[PDB]
Design an enzyme around this catalytic site. Structure first.
Site, PDB file in Angstrom:
ATOM      1  N   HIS A   1      61.044 -99.649  22.836  1.00 57.14           N
ATOM      2  CA  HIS A   1      59.850 -98.871  23.142  1.00 57.14           C
ATOM      3  C   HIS A   1      58.612 -99.352  22.403  1.00 57.14           C
ATOM      4  O   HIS A   1      57.513 -99.309  22.960  1.00 57.14           O
ATOM      5  CB  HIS A   1      60.085 -97.391  22.820  1.00 57.14           C
ATOM      6  CG  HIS A   1      58.840 -96.644  22.461  1.00 57.14           C
ATOM      7  ND1 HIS A   1      58.413 -96.488  21.160  1.00 57.14           N
ATOM      8  CD2 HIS A   1      57.927 -96.012  23.234  1.00 57.14           C
ATOM      9  CE1 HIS A   1      57.292 -95.789  21.148  1.00 57.14           C
ATOM     10  NE2 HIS A   1      56.975 -95.488  22.393  1.00 57.14           N
TER      11      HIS A   1
ATOM     12  N   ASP B   1      53.491 -88.691  21.312  1.00 59.95           N
ATOM     13  CA  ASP B   1      53.410 -90.136  21.159  1.00 59.95           C
ATOM     14  C   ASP B   1      51.984 -90.656  21.195  1.00 59.95           C
ATOM     15  O   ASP B   1      51.672 -91.621  20.492  1.00 59.95           O
ATOM     16  CB  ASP B   1      54.234 -90.837  22.242  1.00 59.95           C
ATOM     17  CG  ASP B   1      55.708 -90.893  21.902  1.00 59.95           C
ATOM     18  OD1 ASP B   1      56.037 -90.962  20.700  1.00 59.95           O
ATOM     19  OD2 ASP B   1      56.538 -90.866  22.835  1.00 59.95           O
TER      20      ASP B   1
ATOM     21  N   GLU C   1      53.341 -89.033  26.513  1.00 57.87           N
ATOM     22  CA  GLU C   1      54.582 -89.527  25.937  1.00 57.87           C
ATOM     23  C   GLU C   1      55.184 -90.569  26.868  1.00 57.87           C
ATOM     24  O   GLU C   1      55.218 -90.377  28.086  1.00 57.87           O
ATOM     25  CB  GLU C   1      55.578 -88.387  25.704  1.00 57.87           C
ATOM     26  CG  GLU C   1      57.015 -88.842  25.535  1.00 57.87           C
ATOM     27  CD  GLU C   1      57.702 -88.177  24.364  1.00 57.87           C
ATOM     28  OE1 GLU C   1      57.158 -87.181  23.845  1.00 57.87           O
ATOM     29  OE2 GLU C   1      58.789 -88.647  23.964  1.00 57.87           O
TER      30      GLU C   1
ATOM     31  N   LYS D   1      61.347 -85.229  30.328  1.00 53.19           N
ATOM     32  CA  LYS D   1      60.129 -85.219  29.524  1.00 53.19           C
ATOM     33  C   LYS D   1      59.299 -83.971  29.811  1.00 53.19           C
ATOM     34  O   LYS D   1      58.786 -83.323  28.885  1.00 53.19           O
ATOM     35  CB  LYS D   1      59.313 -86.485  29.789  1.00 53.19           C
ATOM     36  CG  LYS D   1      59.885 -87.743  29.156  1.00 53.19           C
ATOM     37  CD  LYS D   1      60.095 -87.567  27.662  1.00 53.19           C
ATOM     38  CE  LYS D   1      60.723 -88.805  27.047  1.00 53.19           C
ATOM     39  NZ  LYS D   1      60.818 -88.707  25.565  1.00 53.19           N
TER      40      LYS D   1
ATOM     41  N   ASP E   1      66.656-109.116  63.104  1.00 52.06           N
ATOM     42  CA  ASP E   1      65.421-109.882  63.150  1.00 52.06           C
ATOM     43  C   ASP E   1      64.998-110.313  61.749  1.00 52.06           C
ATOM     44  O   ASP E   1      65.257-109.627  60.758  1.00 52.06           O
ATOM     45  CB  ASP E   1      64.313-109.064  63.813  1.00 52.06           C
ATOM     46  CG  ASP E   1      63.622-109.820  64.934  1.00 52.06           C
ATOM     47  OD1 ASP E   1      64.236-110.758  65.484  1.00 52.06           O
ATOM     48  OD2 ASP E   1      62.473-109.474  65.278  1.00 52.06           O
TER      49      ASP E   1
HETATM   50 MG   LIG Z   1      62.093-111.342  65.862  1.00 48.01          MG
END
Ligand SMILES: [Mg+2]
Ligand SMILES: [Mg+2]
Length: 1935
Positions: free
Chosen positions: A62, A94, A108, A127, A1062
């Site tokens: 962190h 924080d 935080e 949180k 495709d």
């Molecule tokens: Mg195609």
């Protein structure tokens, strides 16, 4: 990366805010992967040579990730907010930031090691839970709080954050986190439920034993040796090299000898040679087709099987008129005598009674219908003729009738009858629905729609639809010998004679008309010729199959859509009548013809002309070759229309093959010159051509059963069966250069899997298999057996149904899956992971899969459906989840990650621009596959799946996949019946045992199959395999590009996107010279072309339906990216916008009618067309409700007119502008505030249904469907007798309903035992709409029944609801904003929209034609990633049962539950008591009612022109293409100076001084202006005419004191107010009254009164501020005095039944008078960061009339520069403060140690602490700065995946060496593009001012101070512990 700009981005309003969380992901190229050197030792860890501490490494994950954020001094919660003493005073955030506007921001950060949205949402929720309550408590005790809260969570996949960012910072964060997590894991809490599920699944997998030996026995080629030898041995290298070289030289030779590159011809010669070849090929096809046919030159016949008649509809009636004469009905006889006898018989007495009444057809008064049988004895001649009644054509047939029909035809001219019966019956309902928005726009659009409905084409189609409905109704009657049925069409003088049959597959009918009421004819010539009968005109007994019925019913609602869409696309105004353009008649006529004549092989030509026209976009190195579409065009011809279509198609092909589409980039944009309609001679722009390939498109799910189509299906299923290799060698054992029809090289498969695995392991961090295994184990271990896919389809096909004519004369009747889960729950099983252990054994004891077939009728699409048996679904569901999990974390696939559908193509442009320099060139190819099914031998799937598994799954996957190598398929019984009387001629012989074929057994009723995967079953494994193949292709292309043909290196980025079938490739390059461009284009052309020959190695056969090497255009699924312009075929959804859907309840049809409209809007259509589509949808919905079938429609119409409520048949229409934007919920909300509906809902929420136990209690039983709510009479319908009988066969006591009420706890918790499981099953079988009745008949008749039955039954009799009028009188026994918000959880957005919508009530705009293409934006309406709110049901489960389904917290839980109680009157905190008061009869209706009460509308990805955008802009532009819709400088400097003085360091007296002088020098406009915030400004400025009315009117805030409490003196000198007083005031037009009282220590609020209730939620906080001013507590209770709306405690909402706090008793006439205040006691005041204009109402008690707080978005710089150039303002550190820029810092170095000043005190020290801002541009951490030496990530490169080097074929090299190509002469011609200045590819994609000013207001204070701090030191200052000279700067800083 700095915190200042980030926090300056967000703007917050007063109060606490959480914002909206947003999800960012990876778009650009991932950087990183530096030299990683981790060595764990005593001092911790090492990296590179920097050493970090060990326990610091325990948290580096962190610190490193957010190194540039936490640079503050680590404040605490207490230091910012007042003390609460609730324990949370030690909660350390924080980052706690407080910018110069007091806008507190607590943030935080968190970091999770998950890989999906799961862990992200989990961290967000935890949180929010951690930090919810303390901040709310602290904000509850502030004066004017503006606090924002934000959370930041990151992961290797994406980043979730509610504070807006830019993709660059997201990429920085993600790659920093990648590095940090890597070093973390190299240097080295879940809940209980998942902790149980993981073990439950792991145990099963550990003890799962499949009999591998019996498996190897009962299945052909299932051997574990193949799998282990595939996994163990590595991949060959030399073989791959030689194979690639061979394939490459072969492809090169094929290209040269196929595109005429020999020897030297120029482009024109090659083109004329191509033209000659195409002519020859078309000539040969025509000859070979004509040679086998009855050679004719003229075929007298018709195309429209119905006669052209246009009567003038008369008064409605259903009865045969009698008085007609017969003086000529015997002229011909053999047909006239039949009608004469019919009329004579129906005249006197011969008719009989045949009742076809709705209640019969659904299989459950005067609603019953009356039909007449017949028995007319006909003459022998006519009888013989009737008993008699009931070759391929040639390409040269002279079909000119169709020709001149599409040129001149009265099809759009107005039928002069526009005001008649049916049009009135529709227009009345239309006007009633539209009455909600009576603007001019709505009237104009309704008039246009009616004008469209007046055209003769829809007038002809209407009675055709009526006839079709009548025939569908009469489809299934009883047939007497020689019987007939005579009927009238209820609106037109037309009579029909019907003769049903027994097969129930067609019908015989004959029409008749009076010959004197035929007003007009369609004046065509493709029409069935009728016969004359004197005064009549009859038909000749046609026959219409039951399959071709729905297309006849839906004819008006598609003719209208076609007319409107084509009239708009041409560019005509929807509100301006003109003539048919003579280019529009062709399209409408063609749509009409293709719609009426409904077959395959006729519209197939039109849907195929796309692949032909899709050429001409080919690049100079190749030539357009449409001749590949010859073949798939052969076959017989059987209509005059197919011949014309084929001739026109061939002419279009030969026209195209002569010259491609031009390519001229005039400006920085690109276009294409010459386009034209396919079947026509025209010249139209792209958008007019693209959606012309979709003329005959439609959808259905009716399960057609015609023998022909079913035979074609059976043929298609078995095509490549006999092509089995008959050798178990090349199916996964060894390599092969030239593979056969079903083989595949193993080493190439291993190479592709290795490539994809390396790509995955590089995108995400390594050690990913563990996360995947845990994710799969979790997602499997939680599947209960009850929450399966109920109401699905199963197959009752067992071993017994294997002998035709031994089990026949019966019905198959496939069934549902619910029966299986029922008979399983009976056997004592609860978890899905338990049933498979015996389901697998039950399957293995058999020898097949027992698959049954299913086919719908849509002429094209996904028609086939393979239904399985439960024992197969139970084992397939456990493997498809693993497949989807493994597939979800891929970067290419677009079926598990749907959003990537629109990201990997657009963003590519930016990527191309990034590492190339602007001005690149694209080269694209859109590929496909020929036979994606019946060509994938099922072992490759098993191998490619087991390659990705943690080896705890190998045996299970191998077993569960080995069950696909012997499958048996059922067949229709009627099919074999009729067959046992070409390909079919072989099938019948195989059945009869004459000719032996290798699939069908002799005499048996099935089809065997060994090869081919089923479609829809293995949906994700195929996508995974295609992803592997495409990744290998991408790696190979990057490789070949890395080294040029002769040792050079062309530069370019490759991109690969692919779904199920495709796929696309999007290479892009950048040349410098002229010649290098040519070389590179040739090279990339060969490279892209080699794919067709490289494909067969992986068992993938590329078709001829794929273009190759197109310059600036691609096509992935159905959208075409034409450079910066994106074109979507909108005719598709327009045509498939009204599909008949059978749902058992009303108010559930409008949901789908709105869903399809929203989908069409997404597909792209101006609102002016969406509204017309909605009008047509309403017409369809009413025609499908008995508009033309039941005669009692007038009564229903009259009922619905006086009752606009949905669920009774009424249809709500949206606003003309913004029509299909928001869903049904928005229209419901808007109607619930203007119509009587608001009353009908209010009763449902404010009636305690005790009623002395009367006969009017409960009213309509609570029952919600979808999102809406209605009476339980409708939702209870539907047969369920089979299901409850099955339940009674099990241990279900009849008391269960009652037994449920005794303990509702079993309705929210999952399960504990078997009995409550049975109770949950019983509740599942009744509530939602699960049905059991077989679809033994048609759909339209039974849907009209399901409608009219319920409608009538509610109209007259009971069910337990009452009559219509009975409930209407029960009314006399609306909504308040509180409950209106509690119902619609998105009311604020609706209000915003409506406010932006109440300005376009007029038709005012200009026809300005803008540039070629306004590149629009990508706007998203109301839409969130997951959620933040608690659903209105979980609070009940928690309050009632203690299950913490929500995690609010005691305070917040109590608050929300109390709000809920205040929303629903009868609702109490007792689960048993709440039944005897609220409208219900069982404790189950409430469970279903509460789970659907609140509903949110759907998201919308709408495009809008830029300015980045808004909704007003979209409404301005998107209303119609090529049309728009529309209705100082001292204020800025004043705002700037006000903000700079108020927040500036001064003294309050000095502040007011400078403010008043600034007001003196400046000027202002008069207050006759817009009043949003400058109103207050101009008011306080003009306070220096008559101010009294100025504040009174124009929305002020003031009020006197009518009754002063008293004056009393506290001996400590305190003027206290005691007694009972009455305050009054007038704020935002309420004229409120406040009775107040207090006699002890303080005062308290007694009661409040309001004259209105519109603006309630603001008056509340206004009264809060007023009490804060006058100082009155709001804690003590009161004695309730009246019938209050609600009550309030602590500025909170409380219900009236609780009698807790002060009640707000609204009385419209509660108080109407004003106080007449004196204008002389008016003052101005300046509090810290606050401006006030106030008046003292009592001694020591003041009142703030008006207030002001400056924002942060008004810190200008132009105004600052101007103020700099001024000296007269004696008002101006102040000089460097207002005007941002002898010395300044020298004097105040020591002024802080000793207070010696006549100006601001502490404020200057609070301000000048901003040296950390300039120190933020430098002084980063060590590892955060040493790791900036990283190079970008180069690429994937096959030399790494194959671990060795590879050489390549230098064919083009030696060719250009010798000179046998002369490349410079091939490209001469077509324009050059290297020097062409063009924009980059791609279409889609206040930060500026806020960032500029936040980085700007630093220098002007610490300019020289930064220089000093740099000069004194630059390296040691980066450390804070090292310093712990310049004692002045450190003092300025802190300490
Ligand atoms: Mg195609
Ligand atoms: Mg195409």
């Amino acid at each position: 990366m700095n915190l200042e700009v980030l926090c300056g981005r967000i703007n917050v309003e007063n109060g606490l805010s959480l914002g909206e969380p947003g999800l960012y992901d990876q778009i650009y190229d991932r950087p990183g992967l530096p030299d990683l050197d981790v060595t764990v030792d005593a001092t911790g860890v090492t990296v590179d040579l920097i050493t970090i501490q060990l326990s610091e490494a325990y948290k580096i994950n962190h610190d490193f990730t957010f190194s540039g954020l936490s640079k503050t001094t680590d404040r605490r919660l207490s230091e910012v907010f007042p003390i609460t003493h609730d324990g949370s005073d030690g909660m350390t955030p924080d980052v706690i930031h407080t910018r110069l506007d007091g806008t507190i921001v607590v943030v935080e950060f968190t970091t999770t090691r998950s890989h999906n949205i799961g862990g992200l949402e989990a961290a967000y929720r935890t949180k929010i839970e951690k930090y919810r309550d303390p901040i709310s408590r602290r904000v509850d005790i502030m004066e004017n709080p503006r606090v924002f809260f934000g959370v930041i969570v990151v992961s290797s996949g994406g980043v979730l954050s509610n504070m807006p960012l830019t993709q660059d910072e997201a990429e920085e964060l993600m790659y920093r986190f990648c590095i940090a997590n890597e070093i973390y894991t190299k240097a080295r809490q879940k809940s209980e439920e998942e902790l149980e599920a993981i073990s439950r699944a792991l145990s099963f997998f550990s003890l799962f034993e499949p009999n591998i030996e019996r498996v190897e026995g009962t299945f052909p080629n299932s051997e574990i040796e193949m799998l282990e030898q595939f996994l163990s041995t590595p991949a060959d290298v030399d073989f791959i090299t030689k194979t690639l070289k061979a394939k490459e030289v072969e492809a090169y030779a094929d290209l040269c000898d196929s595109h005429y590159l020999k020897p030297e011809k120029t482009i024109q010669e090659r083109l004329e040679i191509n033209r000659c070849e195409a002519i020859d090929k078309t000539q040969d096809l025509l000859a070979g087709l004509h040679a086998r046919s009855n050679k004719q030159t003229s075929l007298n016949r018709g195309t429209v099987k119905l006669p052209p008649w246009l009567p003038k509809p008369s008064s409605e009636s259903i009865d045969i008129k009698t008085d007609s004469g017969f003086g000529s009905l015997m002229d011909h006889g053999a047909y006239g005598e039949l009608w004469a006898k019919c009329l004579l018989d129906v005249s006197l007495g011969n008719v009989e009674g045949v009742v076809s009444d709705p209640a019969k057809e659904l299989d459950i008064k005067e609603a019953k219908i009356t039909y007449r049988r017949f028995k007319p004895a006909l003459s022998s001649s006519a009888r013989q003729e009737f008993s008699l009644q009931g070759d391929a054509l040639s390409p040269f047939l002279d079909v000119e009738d169709i020709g001149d029909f599409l040129t001149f035809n009265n099809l759009l001219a107005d039928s002069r009858y526009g005001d008649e019966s049916v049009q009135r019956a529709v227009s009345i309902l239309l006007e009633k629905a539209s009455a909600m928005q009576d603007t001019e726009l709505t009237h104009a659009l309704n008039d246009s729609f009616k004008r469209n409905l007046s055209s003769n084409v829809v007038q002809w189609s209407l009675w055709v639809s009526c006839l079709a409905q009548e025939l569908a109704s009469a489809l299934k009657q009883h047939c007497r010998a020689g019987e007939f049925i005579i009927k009238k069409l209820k609106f037109w003088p037309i009579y029909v004679i019907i003769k049903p049959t027994k097969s129930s597959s067609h019908i015989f009918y004959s029409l008749g008309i009076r010959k004197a009421d035929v007003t007009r004819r369609l004046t065509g010539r493709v029409f069935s010729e009728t016969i004359d009968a004197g005064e009549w005109e009859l038909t000749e007994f046609k026959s219409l199959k039951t399959c071709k019925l729905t297309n006849l019913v839906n004819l008006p609602c598609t003719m209208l859509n076609s007319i409107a869409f084509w009239r708009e696309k041409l560019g005509v105004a929807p509100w301006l009548v003109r003539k048919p353009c003579s280019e529009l008649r062709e399209q409408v006529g063609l749509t009409f013809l293709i719609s009426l004549e409904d077959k395959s092989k006729t519209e197939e030509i039109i849907t195929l002309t796309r692949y032909t026209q899709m050429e001409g976009f080919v690049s100079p190195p190749m030539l357009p070759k449409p001749q590949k579409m010859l073949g798939k065009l052969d076959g017989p011809l059987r209509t005059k229309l197919q011949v014309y279509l084929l001739r026109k198609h061939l002419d279009c092909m030969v026209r195209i093959a002569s010259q491609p589409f031009s390519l001229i980039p005039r400006e920085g944009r690109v276009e294409w010159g010459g386009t034209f309609h396919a079947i026509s001679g025209r010249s139209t722009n792209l958008e007019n051509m693209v959606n012309s390939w979709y003329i005959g498109y439609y959808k259905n799910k009716e399960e057609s059963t015609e023998l022909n189509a079913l035979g074609e299906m059976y043929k298609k299923i078995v095509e490549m069966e006999e092509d089995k290799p008959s050798s178990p060698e090349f199916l996964g054992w060894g390599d092969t250069d030239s593979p056969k029809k079903h083989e595949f090289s193993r080493s190439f498969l291993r190479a592709a899997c290795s490539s994809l695995e390396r790509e995955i392991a590089q995108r995400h961090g390594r050690q990913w298999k563990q996360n995947l295994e845990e994710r799969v184990l979790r997602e499997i271990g939680t599947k209960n057996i009850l929450d399966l896919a109920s109401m699905k389809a199963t197959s009752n096909f067992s071993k017994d149904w294997e002998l035709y004519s031994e089990v026949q004369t019966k019905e198959y009747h496939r069934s549902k899956l619910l029966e299986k889960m029922a008979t399983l729950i009976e056997k004592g099983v609860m978890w899905y992971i338990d049933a498979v252990g015996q389901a697998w054994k039950a399957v293995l004891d058999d020898g097949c899969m027992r698959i049954c077939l299913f086919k719908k009728n849509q002429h094209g699409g996904l028609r086939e459906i393979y239904v399985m048996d439960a024992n197969a679904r139970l084992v397939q569901f456990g493997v498809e989840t693993m497949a989807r999990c493994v597939c979800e974390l891929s970067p290419h696939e677009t079926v598990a990650n749907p959003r990537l559908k629109n990201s990997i193509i657009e963003n590519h442009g930016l990527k191309s621009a990034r590492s190339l320099g602007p001005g690149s060139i694209n080269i694209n190819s859109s590929n496909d596959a020929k036979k994606w099914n019946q060509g994938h031998y099922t072992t490759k799937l098993a191998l490619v799946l087991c390659w990705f598994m943690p080896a705890k799954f190998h045996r299970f996957i191998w077993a569960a996949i080995s069950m696909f190598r012997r499958k048996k398929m059922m067949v229709d019984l009627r099919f074999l019946a009729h067959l046992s009387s070409p390909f079919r001629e072989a099938m019948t012989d195989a059945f009869h045992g004459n000719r032996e074929v290798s699939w069908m057994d002799k005499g048996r009723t099935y089809i065997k199959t060994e090869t081919g995967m089923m479609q829809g079953i293995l949906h994700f494994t195929s996508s995974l395999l295609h992803s592997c193949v495409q990744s290998f292709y991408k790696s190979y292309f990057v490789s070949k590009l890395k080294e040029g043909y002769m040792g050079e290196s062309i530069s370019g980025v490759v991109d690969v996107i692919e779904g199920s079938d495709d796929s696309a490739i999007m290479i892009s390059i950048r040349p410098k010279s002229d010649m290098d461009e040519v070389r590179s284009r040739f090279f990339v052309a060969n490279l892209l072309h080699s794919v067709k020959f490289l494909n067969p190695l992986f068992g993938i056969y590329s078709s001829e339906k794929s273009t190759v090497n197109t310059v600036y255009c691609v096509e992935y699924n159905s959208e075409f990216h034409f450079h910066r312009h994106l074109v979507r075929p909108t005719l598709r959804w327009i045509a498939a916008s009204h599909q008949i859907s059978e749902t058992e309840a009303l108010a559930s049809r409008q949901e789908d009618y709105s869903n399809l409209l929203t989908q069409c809007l997404e597909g792209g259509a101006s609102f002016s067309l969406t509204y017309l589509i909605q009008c047509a949808q309403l017409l369809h919905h009413y025609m499908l409700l008995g508009l033309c079938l039941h005669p009692l429609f007038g009564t229903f119409m009259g009922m619905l007119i006086s009752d606009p409520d949905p669920a009774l048949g009424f249809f709500l229409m949206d606003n003309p502008a913004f029509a299909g934007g928001a869903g049904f919920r928005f229209n419901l909300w808007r109607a619930c505030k203007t119509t009587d509906l608001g009353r009908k809902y209010a009763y449902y929420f404010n009636e305690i249904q005790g009623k002395t136990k009367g006969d009017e209690d409960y009213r309509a039983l609570d029952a919600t469907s979808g999102g809406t709510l209605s009476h339980s009479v409708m939702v209870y319908w539907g047969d369920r007798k089979k299901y409850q009988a099955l339940l009674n066969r099990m241990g279900l006591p009849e008391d269960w309903v009652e037994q449920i009420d005794e303990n509702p706890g079993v309705l929210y918790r999952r399960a504990a035992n078997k009995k409550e499981l049975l109770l949950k099953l019983a509740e599942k079988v009744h509530s939602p709409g699960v049905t059991s009745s077989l679809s033994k008949g048609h759909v339209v008749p039974r849907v009209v029944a399901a409608g009219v039955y319920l409608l009538s039954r509610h109209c007259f009799r009971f069910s337990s609801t009452q009559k219509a009028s009975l409930i209407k009188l029960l009314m006399m026994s609306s909504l308040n904003p509180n409950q209106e918000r509690m119902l619609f959880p998105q009311a604020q957005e609706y209000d915003r929209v409506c406010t932006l919508l109440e300005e376009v009530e007029h038709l005012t705009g200009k026809f300005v034609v803008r540039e070629r293409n306004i590149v629009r934006s990508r706007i998203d309406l109301f839409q969130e990633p997951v959620d933040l709110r608690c659903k209105a049901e979980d609070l009940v489960s928690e309050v009632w049962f203690g299950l913490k389904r929500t995690k609010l917290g005691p305070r917040l839980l109590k608050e929300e539950w109390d709000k809920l109680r205040a929303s629903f009157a009868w609702l109490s905190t007792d689960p048993s008591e709440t039944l005897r008061d609220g409208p219900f009869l069982s404790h189950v209706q409430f469970r279903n009612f509460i789970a659907h009460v609140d509903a949110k509308s759907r998201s919308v990805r709408l495009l809008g022109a830029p300015v980045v955008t808004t909704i007003s802009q979209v409404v301005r532009m998107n209303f119609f293409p090529g049309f728009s819709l529309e209705a100082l400088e001292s204020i800025s400097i004043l705002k700037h100076v006000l903000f700079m003085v108020l927040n500036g360091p001064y003294t309050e007296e000095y502040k007011l001084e400078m403010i008043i002088e600034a007001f003196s020098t400046l000027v202002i406009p008069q207050p006759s202006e817009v009043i949003r915030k400058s109103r207050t400004m101009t008011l306080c400025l003009l306070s220096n005419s008559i101010l009294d009315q100025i504040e009174r009117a124009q929305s002020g805030t003031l009020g006197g004191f009518s009754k002063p409490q008293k004056t009393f003196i506290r001996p400590g000198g305190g003027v206290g107010y005691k007694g009972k007083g009455v305050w009054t005031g007038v704020m935002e037009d309420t004229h409120v009254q406040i009775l107040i009282d207090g006699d002890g220590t303080s005062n308290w609020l007694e009661e409040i009164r309001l004259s209105s209730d519109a603006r309630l939620y603001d008056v509340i906080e206004s009264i809060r501020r007023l009490c804060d001013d006058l100082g009155i507590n709001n804690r003590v209770a009161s004695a309730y005095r009246g019938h209050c709306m609600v009550r309030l405690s602590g500025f909170k909402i409380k219900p009236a039944s609780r009698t807790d706090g002060c009640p707000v008793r609204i009385m419209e006439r509660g108080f109407r008078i004003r106080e007449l205040q004196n204008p002389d006691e008016v003052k101005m005041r300046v509090r810290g960061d606050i401006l006030n204009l106030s008046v003292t109402i009592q001694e020591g008690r003041v009142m703030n009339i008006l207030s002001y707080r400056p924002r942060d978005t008004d810190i200008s710089e132009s105004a600052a520069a101007y103020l700099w150039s001024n000296r007269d303002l004696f008002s101006f550190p102040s000089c460097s403060w207002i005007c941002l820029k002898a010395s300044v810092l020298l004097a105040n170095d020591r002024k802080t140690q000793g207070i010696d000043n006549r100006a601001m005190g502490n404020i200057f020290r609070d301000c000048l602490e901003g040296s950390l801002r300039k120190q933020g541009l430098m002084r980063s951490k060590l590892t955060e700065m040493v790791e900036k030496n990283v190079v970008p990530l180069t690429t994937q490169e096959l030399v790494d995946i194959l671990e060795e080097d590879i050489d390549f074929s230098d064919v083009i090299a030696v060719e250009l060496s010798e000179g046998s190509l002369d490349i410079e002469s091939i490209f001469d011609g077509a324009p050059i593009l290297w020097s062409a200045e063009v924009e980059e590819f791609g279409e889609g994609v206040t930060l500026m001012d806020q960032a500029a000013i936040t980085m700007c207001a630093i220098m002007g204070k610490e300019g020289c101070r930064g220089l000093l701090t740099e000069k004194r030191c630059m390296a040691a200052i980066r450390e804070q512990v090292r310093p712990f000279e310049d004692s002045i700067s450190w003092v300025s800083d802190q300490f």
